[PDB]
Amino acid sequence: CPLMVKVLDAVRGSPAINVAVHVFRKAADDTWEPFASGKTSESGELHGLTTEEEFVEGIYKVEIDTKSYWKALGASPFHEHAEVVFTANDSGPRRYTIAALLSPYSYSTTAVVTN
Amino acid sequence: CPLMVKVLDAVRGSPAINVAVHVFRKAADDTWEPFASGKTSESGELHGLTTEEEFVEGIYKVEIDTKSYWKALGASPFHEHAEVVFTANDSGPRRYTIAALLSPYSYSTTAVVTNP
Amino acid sequence: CPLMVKVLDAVRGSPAINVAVHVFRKAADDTWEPFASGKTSESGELHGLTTEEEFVEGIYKVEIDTKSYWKALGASPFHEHAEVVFTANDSGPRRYTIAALLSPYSYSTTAVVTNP
Amino acid sequence: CPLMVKVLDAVRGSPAINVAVHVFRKAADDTWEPFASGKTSESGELHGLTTEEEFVEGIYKVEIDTKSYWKALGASPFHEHAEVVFTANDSGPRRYTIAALLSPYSYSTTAVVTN
């Protein structure tokens, strides 16, 4: 699996479960076109987003619909969503894990890129 | 100043200087329309982006140009930029401070919102 | 002020007010000796902990009493406190700002170090 | 496994590998006594720290020797180490994953507690 997304909840200290995640790739005319999407599991992870063949170099945006997540749990969300924008670079064989740590008014995201 | 941005470099333990920041605001046609932009100073802070009058209700997107910042310092960053999207002044004017902590492959961003 | 602490609440998007902070400094016998303590103000900042004269070289430990802070606000935090340990003024006096971002089960802490 | 530790490197966007981790439990006289320790693997993880039987309620401190880690890679570390202090509470069945994200002058730590 070339691209993984893991989402954690910093309030409850648990994985962010029923979370919608949309991945877009930047089209030649700079528009963002749907690339992949899904909902985090009970482990806060989303696998099977794409395949090695489809995941070509280019700019990608991982959009995490955090607002709905926090609303369900009664917290008042700050962000509309979390946006992770990056360039997939082939240079060598790589796997991407976009990790996101969420709080109502804050979030962190790290990219773990392994061989 | 109703919208400020402060950026820190977690590798150097100092303000993130000369970081370009672009603010957009969702238009009626769901298009991201340019709202304001600037760059952080020696203290890693960006003030004067907009005024209370101009900063009306809306969904804003604050794009912090992290990639350009790291590249200029000789690093190989992962992200293109940090994108902070949020609805503003939904219940009256508020002062927003968008803080961002930067590392080549990871960044934190957290808003401090106060009633003026 | 050579050692400042600033704390933010990532759940409320505001300064972390009334947060007790205890500073210790490793003694000759490797014991943690009390150095200074205080609590953050309405702006989530703690100034006046020590002076340049008193803040000598050494390994310091800044304990941010996060648990007491969350409990008082009705939350069930994971950590007892945030512990920032670091060697200070190893190459001359420096001004240190220990910043901490708090959530019930997670916290970030990052130092901004500048030459006066 | 009751207690896990995962360490990531935010500079290189990879797991913090050869990292020493010491776990201490607070003794009745408030001193910190050795409880467990090891070195993160190639996946930046440390399993087998303790057993369900030995992991009793109490206050624990996870010390991550980050200074040596950064020195090896040529970065100038700020912290002597990362310290995660917490109370193990039985109330229900739980697993602890102490995650730490490291940067030379900054680090984050989250506690993921699952059933």
From Swiss-Prot, chains B, C:
Tissue: Detected in serum and cerebrospinal fluid (at protein level). Highly expressed in choroid plexus epithelial cells. Detected in retina pigment epithelium and liver.
Effect caused by changing residue 80 to Q: In AMYLD1; amyloid polyneuropathy and cardiomyopathy
GO process terms (BP): negative regulation of glomerular filtration; phototransduction, visible light; purine nucleobase metabolic process; retinoid metabolic process
Chain positions found as Sulfocysteine: 1
Positions bearing 4-carboxyglutamate: 33
Record GO cellular component, one term: extracellular exosome
Outcome recorded upon mutating residue 21 to M: In AMYLD1; amyloid polyneuropathy; by far the most frequent mutation
UniProt keyword list: Amyloid, Amyloidosis, Cytoplasm, Disease variant, Gamma-carboxyglutamic acid, Glycoprotein, Hormone, Neuropathy, Phosphoprotein, Secreted, Signal, Sulfation, Thyroid hormone, Transport
Outcome reported for the amino acid change (mutating residue 40 to A): In AMYLD1; amyloid polyneuropathy
Family, per entry: Belongs to the transthyretin family.
Name of the molecule in the record: Transthyretin
Organism: Homo sapiens
Phylogenetic lineage: Eukaryota, Metazoa, Chordata, Craniata, Vertebrata
Name of the encoding gene: TTR
